[PDB]
Each structure stands twice: as structure tokens, then as C-alpha cells.
């Protein structure tokens, strides 16, 4: 539709792969409770376990700035 | 030669008295000099709006005096003065004469 999506951060791709993991190991679970548990586990992770995700998010940010260098956010009504 | 503050603004209400009432009325510690001029302006315009409708009511009734029946008529017949004075009742004023249409015969 022409809409540029926001690039994924560390927690979104982490919760994406881990929610796909939980949905392939657990049936009959509501997704709000899944995301509550995923936020809980992400806040009990140490920072030593998160550098690949934040680095990958930084790669998406440099890909985004190299893909659109004259980009500026414009909120509309 | 010096000219009064009521006619400095070109008005009738005294700027000094509304200034004194704002001071001794205990609304703030200080009060701006534009405050009594603005307040006398909106006050003078407000009683001008009352007295113009009152005079049109009294001349409409073929009377030459403003009795408070004319003030009650001029206030209750209006729309945006009725919102300003909806809770206030008027001494010796009576009501706005209006009868519900189902009470009236056909």
C-alpha cells in the first residue's frame, strides 16, 4: 500500500522467534499472556545475552538509513 | 488638565471603583491595570445588552418605565442571556408567559 513499516528492534524479532517457539511447543495459550511472559523473560535476561539482537537491530538501522538517506518522519491526520 | 479613567476608555462605569473592588475583594495580591478597564468594558456592555432589551420590551408594552417584569421578560426571552442567568430568579418579576400546547384546547 506504499506504507513504509518501522524496522524491527531487538525485542520484536526476539519475541517473534520465541513466540513462534512457544506456539510450536504449547497449544491453547492466549497471546496476551504470551507477550506478558515474553516481556517478563526479556527483562530477566542479562545484557550479556542481548548483544546479537541489538547489533542486528543496528544493522537494520544502518540498512534503513542507507536505503533512505533523505528520510524524515512526518505524522499526518 | 486631566481626564478620568472611565472616559479614558470612553466608558461610564468607574475604573477606580472596580479597581478598588478587585483589590479589597481579595482575589490576588496584585492586579493588572488592564484588568479594571477590561472588566468595566464587559460590565458596561452587559448592562447595555440588558437595558436595550428592557427598553424594547417596555416600549413594546406601550409603557415608559422599566419595571422588573420587563427585566424578567428580556432575560427569559433571550437565549444566551438565559444561560447566564438561568439559576437566578428575579424579585417581583413573574414568569415568562408560555403555556404547554397539550393543555390548550383544539
Amino acid at each position: 500500500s506504499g506504507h513504509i513499516k518501522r524496522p524491527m528492534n531487538a525485542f520484536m524479532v526476539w519475541s517473534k522467534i520465541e513466540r513462534r517457539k512457544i506456539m510450536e511447543q504449547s497449544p491453547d495459550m492466549h497471546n496476551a499472556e504470551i507477550s506478558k511472559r515474553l516481556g517478563k523473560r526479556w527483562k530477566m535476561l542479562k545484557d550479556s545475552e542481548k548483544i546479537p539482537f541489538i547489533r542486528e537491530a543496528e544493522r537494520l538501522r544502518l540498512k534503513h538509513m542507507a536505503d533512505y538517506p533523505d528520510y524524515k518522519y512526518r505524522p499526518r491526520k | 488638565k486631566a481626564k478620568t479613567r472611565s472616559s479614558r476608555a470612553g466608558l461610564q462605569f468607574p475604573v477606580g471603583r472596580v479597581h478598588r473592588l478587585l483589590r479589597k475583594g481579595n482575589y490576588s495580591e496584585r492586579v493588572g491595570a488592564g484588568a479594571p478597564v477590561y472588566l468595566a468594558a464587559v460590565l458596561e456592555y452587559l448592562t447595555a445588552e440588558i437595558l436595550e432589551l428592557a427598553g424594547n420590551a417596555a416600549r413594546d408594552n406601550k409603557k415608559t418605565r422599566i419595571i422588573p417584569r420587563h427585566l424578567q421578560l428580556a432575560i427569559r426571552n433571550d437565549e444566551e442571556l438565559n444561560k447566564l442567568l438561568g439559576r437566578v430568579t428575579i424579585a417581583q418579576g413573574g414568569v415568562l408567559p408560555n403555556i404547554q400546547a397539550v393543555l390548550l384546547p383544539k
Partner: protein, 98 residues
């Protein structure tokens, strides 16, 4: 054979002449006696200015006339013309009185 009006026919003329006229409809002396009777129970031996009893009579007539307007609105709403005390209690209840 004397001539008689119908119920309601004289009532509209009375409604019109009382809406036109601006005087007080209850006498000043029973209102003086009732106000002095009521104000015993808060402090005995009070003197009432005539202007104070007149102001109480003005506000009293205004409050009862507004309450009877709302009573007629509620009685018309229930498809009646004869107002009833439940209409008074209802119009007091909606108004925030009780």
C-alpha cells in the same frame, strides 16, 4: 337558569392572568407567622425585618413555581394533566434534591 363554565375553561384564563401579573400570591402575614414559627427552633427570640420576610417570600414563590413547572412537565410526560404527589417527588428526585 344561571350560566356555568366548564372545568378547565376558567383555568386557562387564570393561568394567563397569573403569568402576566407579578405580585405575590400568598399573604404576607401568614408567611410572617410561619417564618417566625420555624425560626424558633434554631434560636428563640429573633426579630425578622420586613424586607427579610419579603425576600423569603419572593424566593419561596420562585422555588414553588419552578417546582410546579417541573411537576407539570413530569405529569405531561406520563400523559396526565392532573399532577400528583409522585410527580413532585420525581421532579425533586431528578433535580438533585433528594
Amino acid at each position: 337558569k344561571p350560566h356555568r363554565y366548564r372545568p378547565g375553561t376558567v383555568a386557562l384564563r387564570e393561568i394567563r392572568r397569573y403569568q402576566k401579573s407579578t405580585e405575590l400570591l400568598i399573604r404576607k402575614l401568614p408567611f410572617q407567622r410561619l417564618v417566625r414559627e420555624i425560626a424558633q427552633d434554631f434560636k428563640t427570640d429573633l426579630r425578622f425585618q420586613s424586607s427579610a420576610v419579603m425576600a423569603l417570600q419572593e424566593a419561596s414563590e420562585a422555588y414553588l413555581v419552578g417546582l410546579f413547572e417541573d411537576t407539570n412537565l413530569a405529569a405531561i410526560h406520563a400523559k396526565r394533566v392532573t399532577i400528583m404527589p409522585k410527580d413532585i417527588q420525581l421532579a425533586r428526585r431528578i433535580r438533585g434534591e433528594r
